[PDB]
């Protein structure tokens, strides 16, 4: 047969940067869009779903929403004359 569930959590996360890929297999997008992760088995692996694209986006390259956590970075210095 086939059956089986788990906690019901959906985590959403927000491309930091652009994840381009040479494959169409890996779900690429652009800094910003908001992808909606199934499941979450790897470490550092988890599949993702877009509105009309679909497929495995990397955990490392996404800031995820519920994060509890706060980084200082901005950075600055456009030129000078």
């Known amino acids: 047969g086939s059956s ?8 959403s996360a927000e491309a930091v940067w652009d994840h381009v890929t040479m494959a169409n297999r890996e779900l690429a ?13 790897n470490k550092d692996w988890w599949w993702g779903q877009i509105d009309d694209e679909e497929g495995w986006f990397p955990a490392s390259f996404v800031r995820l929403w519920v994060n509890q956590e706060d980084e200082v ?9």
Do not use: H, T
């Open 4 to 11: 089986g569930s788990s906690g019901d959590s959906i985590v």
């Open 73 to 81: 970075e901005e950075g600055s210095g456009p030129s000078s004359g």
């Open 29 to 41: 997008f652009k800094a910003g869009d908001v992808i909606k992760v199934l499941d979450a088995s």
